[PDB]
Amino acid sequence: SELAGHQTSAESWGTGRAVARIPRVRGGGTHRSGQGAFGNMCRGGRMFAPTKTWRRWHRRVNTTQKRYAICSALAASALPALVMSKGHRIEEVPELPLVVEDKVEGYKKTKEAVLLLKKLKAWNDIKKVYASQRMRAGKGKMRNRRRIQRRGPCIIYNEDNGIIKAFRNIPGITLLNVSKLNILKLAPGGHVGRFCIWTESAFRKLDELYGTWRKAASLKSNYNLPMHKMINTDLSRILKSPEIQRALRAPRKKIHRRVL
Amino acid sequence: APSRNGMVLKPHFHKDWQRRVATWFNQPARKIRRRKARQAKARRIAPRPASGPIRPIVRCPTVRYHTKVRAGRGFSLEELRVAGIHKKVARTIGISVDPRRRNKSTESLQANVQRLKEYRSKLILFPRKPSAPKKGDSSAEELKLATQLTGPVMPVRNVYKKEKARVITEEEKNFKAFASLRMARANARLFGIRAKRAKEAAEQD
């Protein structure tokens, strides 16, 4: 707001002239003189709790939790069930996360990019974004955002040689870098498991940039991989293992209902 | 107005703090401005390095921070005279000159003099006319670079003395006990009163 509704000078009547105890703008001739002054319940009045510029907008996150969320999103982008349950079309798509050659990053014409997506069968995932490019619902069409454009695949690379030019005007695609991994692009809307397309140098630089549980990361100084809570976590295998079923009471499936 | 068990608070908000609120919404703006300022400096000014003048090895005056080291301001005119060059000639070479800095330590004196000798060794200059004073041929293909980053000779140089191996020794371990500190403290607290009693003993004959 930053400029008050208190521009109108006003006083209250009091006991006599029994209209109200609210302040009233004072004058004559103009029929506003005698109406509601500043206040929340009045016409043209200052709002309750005027929104201020010193609200606590921006929120700091721990860097360990940032890297934890990046590792969790990249781990959830590997399972087929998670990405299919997020909604990418992985029917005719070959093996999970796709590793393309180093001749991909040197593309300049995007016809070769469209041909690459058609040969790698991500063209169905692009065609879903073509089929859903509808108009924004609500009053959000006034502030320059009139398109519902769903997110498709993302291609993560290093050593840019024209790959942003080749992948710049495809609907639904996402520009993303190895050294700059974005949580807002790897898992938009807080939903894990986005379909991603990797390169050879990217897929080899991941092991250099995070490491295994034996060694540390060689690019990040003070980072290690998280502790794994349940190592062999197949609960059906555990509950159907003979070591657990050796020490069970009995299958008790009697009901013992109410007897009249 | 107060309540259950909590800390007594005295907030300094009685003054009209609503008018004077400065919130850094232009913090990435200043970041981009100062990036452009540094890059425009490296473009327009010279092949002189960033943070142009060289800073000295300097100790911090405290009982707290004197164990560490610091990049100072200037090269302390006695030190510059021992290095043997003129003042403004040094300022044009790239030597930072501060006339106020004194010299109490011969160790810091010789350290800054050797730092000046290393800087004079690393110096490569190019005058306009090809009469060649203090130069020669294409020295290292115009010295292989254009602009250094964050100090020319790494001005921290935190020296690390180790003294790793020595044998357990004679009765220093039997003489350097806790009582030496208390005896020195008592001697420093009673130094002058013993002198007054000695003067009174000389007075009373």
């Binding site: 006034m142 320059n144 710049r168 005007n169 | -």
Partner: protein
């Protein structure tokens, strides 16, 4: 995608500049596509329209095979008027029909020295 920060993707500012643009900007806004034989013969995609251009209408209430000549170009209303396209009032008086110039296929252009210079700049910039 918009990359230059000196131009708006802003709806209010674009509509403001559009409905309050001066006449030399409105001439560039009121531009019409060309027929396939004329673009094959001249190698040019779009041209502004003038008083003596022959016009085939492609969309609206009247469509196709109506190669007529325009008479008036209201840049205040963003409307050209065509001599062939008529409509009677209640009192039997004819009046022209509002046709937006972006739904207009030009079949013949008026030749002028300035238009030859314009066509030369079009062909040189298209290269």
């Amino acid at each position: 995608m918009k990359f230059n920060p000196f131009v708006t993707s802003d709806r209010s500012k674009n509509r403001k500049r559009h409905f309050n643009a001066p006449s030399h900007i409105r001439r560039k806004i009121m531009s019409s596509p060309l027929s396939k034989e004329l673009r094959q013969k001249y190698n040019v995609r779009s041209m502004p329209i003038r008083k003596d251009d022959e016009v085939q209408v492609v969309r609206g209430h009247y469509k196709g095979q109506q190669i007529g000549k325009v008479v008036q170009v209201y840049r205040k209303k963003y409307v050209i008027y065509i001599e062939r396209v008529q409509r009677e009032k209640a009192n039997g008086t004819t009046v022209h029909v509002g046709i937006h110039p972006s739904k207009v296929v030009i079949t013949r252009l008026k030749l002028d020295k300035d238009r030859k210079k314009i066509l030369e700049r079009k062909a040189k910039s298209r290269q």
